[PDB]
């Protein structure tokens, strides 16, 4: 009973961590785009 | 100017798609845990 | 025991649904930016 | 052109911040469930 709930909890937490990693990468790409757009605005 | 903005937009959207895929996997693991907990409650 | 695990499962699932809603909104803002950038590229 | 691209970028980043906040809440609920399951296993 509890053994299997814990196995499934660990699978949830594994997937959570993959989501957190991909989210930081997305944040970085979005922030890079923002810096570039801002640069092009400033330089004209 | 615009060429590079589009390149960076495509990289954002690539990362977004990977986020959507990992989110469906997370949803599935959470839904599976919920179904199991509910099963054990009913039993 | 199991009663409390189910209460906490429902809180996880509540937060999951809020994450899914915010994610669709983020996708829409990103897709709108893409359409605008593409428009400005095409029109020159 | 660029003014509107920046306006839309700010709206993307606003939504991103709301996603980060909801993600920490989700992480907390998941971590709380894990700690409880572990506690009940140990007991």
Residue numbers in the entry:
A (entry chain BBB), C (entry chain BBB): 312 to 355
B (entry chain AAA), D (entry chain AAA): 312 to 354
From the paper:
Phosphorus starvation response 1 (CrPsr1) from Chlamydomonas and PHOSPHATE STARVATION RESPONSE 1 (AtPHR1) from Arabidopsis were founding members of plant-unique MYB-type coiled-coil (MYB-CC) transcription factors. However, AtPHR1222 – 358 Olig1 and AtPHR1222 – 358 Olig2 bound a biotinylated P1BS immobilized on the GCI chip with ~20-fold reduced affinity when compared to the wild-type control. Together, our experiments suggest that PHR1 may exist as a tetramer or dimer in solution, and that disruption of its plant-unique CC domain interface reduces the capacity of the transcription factor to bind its DNA recognition site. Together, our in vivo experiments reveal that SPX receptors interact with the CC domain of AtPHR1 via the surface-exposed Lys325, His328, and Arg335, and that this interaction negatively regulates PHR activity and PSRs.
Given the fact, that AtPHR1 MYB-CC forms dimers in solution, we cannot exclude the possibility that the CC tetramers represent crystal packing artifacts. Both interfaces are further stabilized by hydrogen bond interactions and several salt bridges. We next sought to identify the binding site for SPX in the PHR CC domain. Mutation of AtPHR1K325, AtPHR1H328, and AtPHR1R335, but not of AtPHR1K308, AtPHR1R318, and AtPHR1R340 to alanine, disrupted the interaction of AtPHR1 with AtSPX1 in yeast.
